[PDB]
C-alpha cells in the first residue's frame, strides 16, 4: 500500500518534466537487428565509452506520421522514461536526429517469450504461473499510475538472464483517467469492448492477461483464425473451449478473466487486483518473493557472453539513413 504511494511520486516528477536528448548516435556501434515490429526496428548496439551493450529502438519519423502514430509515439517515450519496476525494461537514453527517433534500452538477452513458447510448444502450469504472477504485479503498478498498457503478447515479453520477464514495447501505453476509444492492439488479444467500439478502460489489460495465460498453458490462443475479422467474431461471442489438461483452478481463473461482461471481469471489481492474487490458482505463489526476484526461475536461457544474440531470430539488416534535412521537427519537439 505504501510502496505504490512512493512509486507514484517518482513517476509524477518524471511525467511532468521528462528527460530529453541524453545521448547521440555516434556514441554507439550498431551490431545486429534483434527484432522488427509493426512500427520500428530494434538493434543490438555497443556504447563506446562504457563498453555496455544496449537495445536501440529506431523509429522513422515519416513512417510514424504516415501510420498516424504521432501521439502514441510521444506517449511511448514519455511513459517509458518515467516508470521504474523490476519487470519493465529500463530506458537508458533517448535522442532524435533529422530522420529518426531513438530509444536505448537495457539489452534483455534471453529472447522473446514467443520464441521459447513456439519451440517448446506450451508451458506447464507452474511455469506459466511464474510468468503470469510477474505480469499481475506489473499491471498492478501500471494501473496505479493511471496507465493502460494495451499490447500484452509473447512477442512483447522478454526473458532476462535470471529467467524473469521484462515487458517491452510501450507503443500503445496511455495515461488516462476515464475511458479511451482507440482501436489498437493485436487481434488475438483484443477485449470485446475494444472491438465493439464502446469506450474502454484498464479492464482490457486483464482480459489480455487471460489470453496470455491461455496461450502459455495451451500453446495456442483461445481465439484464432486465418483472418482478423473471424477472430473478432469469436472474441465477441466469448465462447472459450479449454484443453483437457487444464486444471480446474486454471479454468476457473480464465472464465473470470475472459469475461465479456465488464461488471464481472476479475481485475475490475470492488476488490481490484486482489481477486486475482487471492484466486486458488495462485495459492502457492509468494507475491513478495516474486517481486524481490528470490524465486528460482523454471527456465534459464543460455548465454555465452555479453553481446550474445543466439536467443533471437535473424533479420535482414538495413542501413540507417539520416537526411540532410530535418523531418517532422515540430511534431516531435517534446521527444
Amino acid at each position: 500500500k505504501e510502496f505504490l504511494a512512493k512509486a507514484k511520486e517518482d513517476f509524477l516528477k518524471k511525467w511532468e518534466t521528462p528527460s530529453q536528448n541524453t545521448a547521440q548516435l555516434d556514441q554507439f556501434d550498431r551490431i545486429k537487428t534483434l527484432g522488427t515490429g509493426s512500427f520500428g526496428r530494434v538493434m543490438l548496439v555497443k556504447h563506446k565509452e562504457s563498453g555496455n551493450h544496449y537495445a536501440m529502438k529506431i523509429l522513422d519519423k515519416q513512417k510514424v506520421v504516415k501510420l498516424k502514430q504521432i501521439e502514441h509515439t510521444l506517449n511511448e517515450k514519455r511513459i517509458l522514461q518515467a516508470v521504474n519496476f523490476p519487470f519493465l525494461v529500463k530506458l537508458e537514453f533517448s535522442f532524435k536526429d533529422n530522420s529518426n527517433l531513438y530509444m536505448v534500452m537495457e539489452y534483455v538477452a534471453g529472447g522473446e517469450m514467443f520464441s521459447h513458447l513456439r519451440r517448446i510448444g506450451r508451458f506447464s502450469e507452474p511455469h506459466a504461473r511464474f510468468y503470469a504472477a510477474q505480469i499481475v504485479l506489473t499491471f498492478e503498478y501500471l494501473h496505479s499510475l493511471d496507465l493502460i498498457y494495451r499490447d500484452l503478447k509473447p512477442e512483447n515479453l522478454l526473458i532476462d538472464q535470471q529467467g524473469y520477464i521484462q515487458v517491452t514495447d510501450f507503443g500503445f501505453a496511455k495515461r488516462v483517467k476515464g475511458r479511451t476509444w482507440t482501436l489498437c492492439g493485436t487481434p488475438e488479444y483484443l477485449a470485446p469492448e475494444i472491438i465493439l467500439s464502446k469506450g474502454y478502460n484498464k479492464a482490457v489489460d486483464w482480459w489480455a492477461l487471460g489470453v496470455l495465460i491461455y496461450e502459455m498453458a495451451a500453446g495456442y490462443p483461445p481465439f484464432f483464425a486465418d483472418q482478423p475479422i473471424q477472430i473478432y467474431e469469436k472474441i465477441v461471442s466469448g465462447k472459450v473451449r479449454f484443453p483437457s489438461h487444464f486444471s480446474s483452478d486454471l479454468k476457473d481463473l480464465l472464465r473470470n478473466l475472459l469475461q465479456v461482461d465488464l461488471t464481472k471481469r476479475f481485475g475490475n471489481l470492488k476488490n481490484g487486483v486482489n481477486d486475482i492474487k487471492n484466486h486458488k490458482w495462485f495459492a502457492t505463489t509468494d507475491w513478495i518473493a516474486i517481486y524481490q526476484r528470490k524465486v528460482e526461475a523454471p527456465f534459464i536461457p543460455k548465454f555465452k557472453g555479453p553481446g550474445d544474440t543466439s536467443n533471437f531470430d535473424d533479420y535482414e539488416e538495413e542501413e540507417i539513413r539520416v537526411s540532410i534535412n530535418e523531418k517532422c521537427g515540430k511534431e516531435f519537439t517534446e521527444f
Binding site: 513456439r118 499490447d151 482501436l183 493485436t186 495456442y220 486465418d226 482478423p228
Partner: peptide, 19 residues
C-alpha cells in the same frame, strides 16, 4: 485437434498490431 488446426493456420508467426 485444435493444436493441428492452429499449426496449419496462417497466424503461428510473430503477430503485428492493428491500428
Amino acid at each position: 485437434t485444435t493444436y493441428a488446426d492452429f499449426i496449419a493456420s496462417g497466424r503461428t508467426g510473430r503477430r503485428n498490431a492493428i491500428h
